[PDB]
Amino acid sequence: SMQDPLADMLTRIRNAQMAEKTVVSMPSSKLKAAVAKVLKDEGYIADFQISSEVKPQLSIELKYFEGKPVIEEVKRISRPGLRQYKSVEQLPKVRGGLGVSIVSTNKGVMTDRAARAAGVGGEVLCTVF
Amino acid sequence: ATINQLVRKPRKRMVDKSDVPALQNCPQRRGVCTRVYTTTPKKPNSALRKVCRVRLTNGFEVSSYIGGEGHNLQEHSVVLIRGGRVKDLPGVRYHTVRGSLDTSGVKDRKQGRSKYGAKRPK
Amino acid sequence: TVRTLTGRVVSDKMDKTVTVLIERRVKHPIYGKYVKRSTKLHAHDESNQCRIGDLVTIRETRPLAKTKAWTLVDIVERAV
Amino acid sequence: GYIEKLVQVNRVAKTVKGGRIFAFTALTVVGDGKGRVGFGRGKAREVPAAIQKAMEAARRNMIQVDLNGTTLQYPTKSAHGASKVYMQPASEGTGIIAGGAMRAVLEVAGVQNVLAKCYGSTNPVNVVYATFKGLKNMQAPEAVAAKRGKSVEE
Amino acid sequence: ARYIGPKCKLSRREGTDLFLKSGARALDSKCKAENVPGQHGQRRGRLSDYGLQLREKQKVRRIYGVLERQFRGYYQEASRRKGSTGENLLQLLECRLDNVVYRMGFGSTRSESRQLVSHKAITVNGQTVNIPSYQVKAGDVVAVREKSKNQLRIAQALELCGQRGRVEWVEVDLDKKAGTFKSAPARSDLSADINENLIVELYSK
RNA sequence: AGUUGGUGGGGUAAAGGCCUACCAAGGCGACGAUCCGUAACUGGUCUGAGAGGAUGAUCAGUCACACUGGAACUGAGACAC
RNA sequence: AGAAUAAGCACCGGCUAACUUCGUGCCAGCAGCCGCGGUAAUACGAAGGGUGCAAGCGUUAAUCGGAAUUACUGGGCGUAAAGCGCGCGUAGGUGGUUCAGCAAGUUGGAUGUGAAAUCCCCGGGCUCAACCUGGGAACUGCAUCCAAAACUACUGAGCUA
RNA sequence: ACGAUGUCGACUAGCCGUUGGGAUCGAUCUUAGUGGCGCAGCUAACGCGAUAAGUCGACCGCCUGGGGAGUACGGC
Ligand SMILES: [Mg+2]
Ligand SMILES: [Mg+2]
Ligand SMILES: [Mg+2]
Ligand SMILES: [Mg+2]
Ligand SMILES: [Mg+2]
Ligand SMILES: [Mg+2]
Ligand SMILES: [Mg+2]
Ligand SMILES: [Mg+2]
Ligand SMILES: [Mg+2]
Ligand SMILES: [Mg+2]
Ligand SMILES: [Mg+2]
Ligand SMILES: [Mg+2]
Ligand SMILES: [Mg+2]
Ligand SMILES: [Mg+2]
Ligand SMILES: [Mg+2]
Ligand SMILES: [Mg+2]
Ligand SMILES: [Mg+2]
Ligand SMILES: [Mg+2]
Ligand SMILES: [Mg+2]
Ligand SMILES: [Mg+2]
Ligand SMILES: [Mg+2]
Ligand SMILES: [Mg+2]
Ligand SMILES: [Mg+2]
Ligand SMILES: [Mg+2]
Ligand SMILES: [Mg+2]
Ligand SMILES: [Mg+2]
Ligand SMILES: [Mg+2]
Ligand SMILES: [Mg+2]
Ligand SMILES: [Mg+2]
Ligand SMILES: [Mg+2]
Ligand SMILES: [Mg+2]
Ligand SMILES: [Mg+2]
Ligand SMILES: [Mg+2]
Ligand SMILES: [Mg+2]
Ligand SMILES: [Mg+2]
Ligand SMILES: [Mg+2]
Ligand SMILES: [Mg+2]
Ligand SMILES: [Mg+2]
Ligand SMILES: [Mg+2]
Ligand SMILES: [Mg+2]
Ligand SMILES: [Mg+2]
Ligand SMILES: [Mg+2]
Ligand SMILES: [Mg+2]
Ligand SMILES: [Mg+2]
Ligand SMILES: [Mg+2]
Ligand SMILES: [Mg+2]
Ligand SMILES: [Mg+2]
Ligand SMILES: [Mg+2]
Ligand SMILES: [Mg+2]
Ligand SMILES: [Mg+2]
């Protein structure tokens, strides 16, 4: 009953990429907005925009390049049932370094390589390829 | 199983029981032969195998197989038995070592005559 | 710099003593999930000023009785 | 590409009034050794003819895989039916650490250091299916750069 | 220990080079070295992968005359050593003392080289070494005894090995019956027909 | 039911229900108390890609015992191979 | 001085490297699993001939692996074993969104310990190795402090999906 | 005691019926149930397919070869 909304955001994005949609809307959240900013900067999504009037809506437009979608495998790691926390040395490199992992560190929400550049670990939110 | 369910009750391994309950973690054991006789095998096969009832040192009463073409076992002969299950005879789970105490091995065996306790003709 | 320990008062029916529950969350050695464990300690309340429900911080000293080797240094929160 | 490899030969039978009719199925993998590979199946009344039909099928529908200089790109996990497959790149010294259908597929394709394992059922046909469904789907660099420039992605 | 028996029945079984004689006449016109021995000899006998591993492992062991406890110890040491164990095994197995005193040209056969090395007739720096397993460090001047320099068996072995090839990494002075090893051989130096990877595949199972 | 806490005293080299007389009814427990079976513990050993699984032969640290059950004397130290 | 003086065991139908003949004829016998034998047995018992190890070779008993076959890494429940007959609810587990604080979890660092040996890396000695030995690495652990505030927890004040 | 399918929540092409209501101009839209097909996706296959057996979260129950056996003994 809406216990974990970040996985809900990821599931909406994956289900749209599977049904070949161009835009996706969802209820807005600060964590979701941070993750969307990181994903947009990394290049997995085209653009995102946040509405106003008390019930903000986060909207994301998707990319496909070829007939396939750009985000082929997005999944959750630290669900509210495990709460996985990792150190700098033991952070996960995904797909041999061609993917990214979103990590919430004490300096904000960034990617695994950016976290290593600052030598700081945190909580692994989700992995994207 | 959910992680919480496993925390409340962890996964448990089931122990493996021994196929040779007698001779408790022992390579082979001595006994005395109560009775020698012959038996019929299971359905696909047909023969007259030679099995001896043995009373061990501990007290277990077991059956054992006299492997070979001839034997010299009477009722009161001391024998030594080792693990190994005769697949054909129901209930037999041990083998009498040839030429150990009162078996003397089998005579005039040339090919692989170490499993049957025969000496080198040389 | 005394090594204190914070806890919640549970029962005080024995004179000049107080029972304190201290809650910790330990990580399961294999499954990686945190579980809340609790410890019951007995502390010396010289002037029995701690009623039930109060939240206090104790300190380790020499044994005062059998199974009583802690003394409360000061109450940090009261109860309703 | 031309390097044969006969993965399996099996005997099957169908029932008719009077008795049984026998046939032989051959599963084979064919490739060159630098990234082209395909697999084929052939059933015939005789073992040789089955092998040649398998080879002809294998030469058709032969695909291209982008390998990382005698090594895989990244650890990958694939599946087909009830069979699951895991592979990951290895160092230069290591050989092909795999078993059965996987070893045939990998040594024909061109890789040499694979360190692979398989879980679930071990049917050679389904294992070959899973191994291609894994190898075919790798991306290689400057193709994950389908988002932005390179050297800012690795 | 050591192997005693026919030295070409092995070649007939394996069907390959398998140097085991002096090489005076030839390799062929002694034993029709193209058929496996015994009554059942003409059959090619197509053999599975395990056959391949067993056959080449026996090939290498018989050419270098090493037993299997020693061979597996050699393989474990090679696996311990870094950098593509497959050729590390060959490099380390080549540095044996008996095979060096053979390949230096002092012996007609590996067995005769072992004969010489065991009976205390060869030096390393003047010190008596008679273990046919000594791993010769690069730089050592392997030589025969000043007493033994007049034996004619060494002379005949040397003149026979005078035409067998040049390895192009050792520096050998032939007048004084001495050898010298500079650096370990490369993979390309040895005969590039038998692969090393199939052995490490065998021992990885 | 000396069971939990307090007071006075005793006792030990030393804190302490360690012992005693009174005061109150407390204390522990499904986070497994009590009871039954089994077993010296650790560094470590064997396996395993790892996580784990089994285990405590040699060597080293700690503990306990000395035909069975108790008790004290001597001393710096013993309830004494 | 003298080649003098010192080779055995198992196996050969498939899994698993290695075949022919003779003798019995569902008998005698073999066997880890499929299984061989009733009158040409490469599976029984012997011969030759091979294959594998070797001062050893097999057999038995015991542990882990293969076994993703107790699945944290890493399994499942319509029909193969597996959703309580169905609600309500205690402890427990989990918690929509905003602002602010704190610093238990979380992260980085410093300090003390983690006995020696054993494990790992580079050397030294016994003709090498086994074995002995120097230096280093490691011992994921634990405790005490300093700094950060994204997420969880705790505190206060809100908002309406 | 069966949908042989635990409860709760979020997303994912469409077509044809029917039950209890709303709107807009017999038609269109929408809501809570009840049925038949069907694209993706899933499945060993049969088949499921917005009333998932699809993609995801929270919590609970249960399984570990067939017999002996849901039996024997003890407890309630
Ligand atoms: Mg057995
Ligand atoms: Mg299976
Ligand atoms: Mg030896
Ligand atoms: Mg009293
Ligand atoms: Mg007092
Ligand atoms: Mg008192
Ligand atoms: Mg005490
Ligand atoms: Mg208990
Ligand atoms: Mg014990
Ligand atoms: Mg005991
Ligand atoms: Mg123990
Ligand atoms: Mg004891
Ligand atoms: Mg190891
Ligand atoms: Mg494993
Ligand atoms: Mg002892
Ligand atoms: Mg000790
Ligand atoms: Mg004592
Ligand atoms: Mg005593
Ligand atoms: Mg006695
Ligand atoms: Mg006494
Ligand atoms: Mg005294
Ligand atoms: Mg004494
Ligand atoms: Mg074979
Ligand atoms: Mg046999
Ligand atoms: Mg015959
Ligand atoms: Mg035979
Ligand atoms: Mg396991
Ligand atoms: Mg097992
Ligand atoms: Mg799991
Ligand atoms: Mg299963
Ligand atoms: Mg049924
Ligand atoms: Mg139900
Ligand atoms: Mg219930
Ligand atoms: Mg309820
Ligand atoms: Mg509650
Ligand atoms: Mg929240
Ligand atoms: Mg809560
Ligand atoms: Mg820390
Ligand atoms: Mg140490
Ligand atoms: Mg701060
Ligand atoms: Mg049911
Ligand atoms: Mg359900
Ligand atoms: Mg439901
Ligand atoms: Mg449901
Ligand atoms: Mg639903
Ligand atoms: Mg349908
Ligand atoms: Mg199913
Ligand atoms: Mg059972
Ligand atoms: Mg009953
Ligand atoms: Mg009853």
mmCIF file of N, CA and C in Angstrom, chain B residues 4 7 23 35 44 64 71 74 85 92 101:
data_model
loop_
_atom_site.group_PDB
_atom_site.id
_atom_site.type_symbol
_atom_site.label_atom_id
_atom_site.label_comp_id
_atom_site.label_asym_id
_atom_site.label_seq_id
_atom_site.Cartn_x
_atom_site.Cartn_y
_atom_site.Cartn_z
ATOM 1 N N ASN B 4 12.626 -11.927 6.702
ATOM 2 C CA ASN B 4 12.129 -11.914 8.073
ATOM 3 C C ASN B 4 11.769 -13.319 8.542
ATOM 4 N N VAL B 7 14.927 -15.056 9.358
ATOM 5 C CA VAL B 7 15.470 -14.562 10.620
ATOM 6 C C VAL B 7 14.775 -15.240 11.793
ATOM 7 N N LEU B 23 29.073 -51.349 13.108
ATOM 8 C CA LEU B 23 30.461 -50.927 12.929
ATOM 9 C C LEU B 23 30.567 -49.398 12.963
ATOM 10 N N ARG B 35 25.464 -68.855 11.797
ATOM 11 C CA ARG B 35 24.793 -69.735 10.851
ATOM 12 C C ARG B 35 25.241 -69.422 9.431
ATOM 13 N N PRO B 44 14.943 -60.325 -11.109
ATOM 14 C CA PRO B 44 15.657 -60.449 -12.395
ATOM 15 C C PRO B 44 16.710 -61.544 -12.402
ATOM 16 N N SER B 64 26.000 -61.296 6.280
ATOM 17 C CA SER B 64 27.187 -60.945 5.519
ATOM 18 C C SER B 64 27.339 -61.905 4.351
ATOM 19 N N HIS B 71 34.096 -71.690 0.212
ATOM 20 C CA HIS B 71 34.331 -71.214 1.566
ATOM 21 C C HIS B 71 34.389 -72.402 2.515
ATOM 22 N N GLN B 74 32.006 -72.799 9.135
ATOM 23 C CA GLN B 74 31.088 -73.596 9.928
ATOM 24 C C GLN B 74 30.408 -72.695 10.954
ATOM 25 N N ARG B 85 27.322 -53.202 0.290
ATOM 26 C CA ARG B 85 25.961 -53.709 0.204
ATOM 27 C C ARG B 85 25.803 -54.597 -1.020
ATOM 28 N N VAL B 92 21.197 -57.857 3.085
ATOM 29 C CA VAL B 92 22.638 -58.002 3.250
ATOM 30 C C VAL B 92 23.301 -56.650 3.041
ATOM 31 N N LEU B 101 40.475 -64.164 9.201
ATOM 32 C CA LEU B 101 40.607 -64.955 10.420
ATOM 33 C C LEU B 101 40.345 -66.435 10.183
#
